[PDB]
Amino acid sequence: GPLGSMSGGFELQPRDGGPRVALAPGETVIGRGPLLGITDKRVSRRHAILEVAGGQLRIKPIHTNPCFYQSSEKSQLLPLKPNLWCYLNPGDSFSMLVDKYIFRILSIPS
Amino acid sequence: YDESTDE
Ligand SMILES: [Mg+2]
Incomplete structure (x- = not known):
């Protein structure tokens, strides 16, 4: 029958060791x-x-200033396409500049 | 955070 609901939350872990940020x-x-x-x-x-x-x-x-993405399996932050949603997997990273403000996605309870 | 973004 119908699949119903799916739960699961996310936190951001700064690459520079700053405090983690839980997402609402x-x-x-x-x-x-x-x-x-x-x-x-x-x-x-x-x-x-x-x-x-x-x-x-x-x-x-x-x-216009872009965001960057690095799959957990790969090793280079590369630009994301502007103005499009992109799913992020737990363990992936994204950044706000090519070499700064980099965050790894962690999975946490909802 | 009052300053305009640098492009
Ligand atoms: Mg503007």
């Missing part, structure tokens, strides 16, 4: 601001959107 259900706009403590003026205050729903995490870059 639904959409969270990320970028320069107090949530992640990013202050570099090259990151927009409305840089990307993250969405947690149904046990999945997706990201959408929303600024």
Whole structure:
């Protein structure tokens, strides 16, 4: 029959060892601001959107200054396509600059 | 965080 609901939450782990950030259900706009403590003026205050729903995490870059993605299996942060949602797997990383503000996706309970 | 984004 019908599959029903799926749970599962997410946390961001900064590559530089800063504190982890748990994500709320639904959409969270990320970028320069107090949530992640990013202050570099090259990151927009409305840089990307993250969405947690149904046990999945997706990201959408929303600024001309891009976001980057590194699959857990690979070794280079590469640009994400502008303005498109992309699912992120636990263990993957994304970043707000090519070489700074890099976060690994961890799986946690909802 | 009041300053405009650098492009
Ligand atoms: Mg502007």
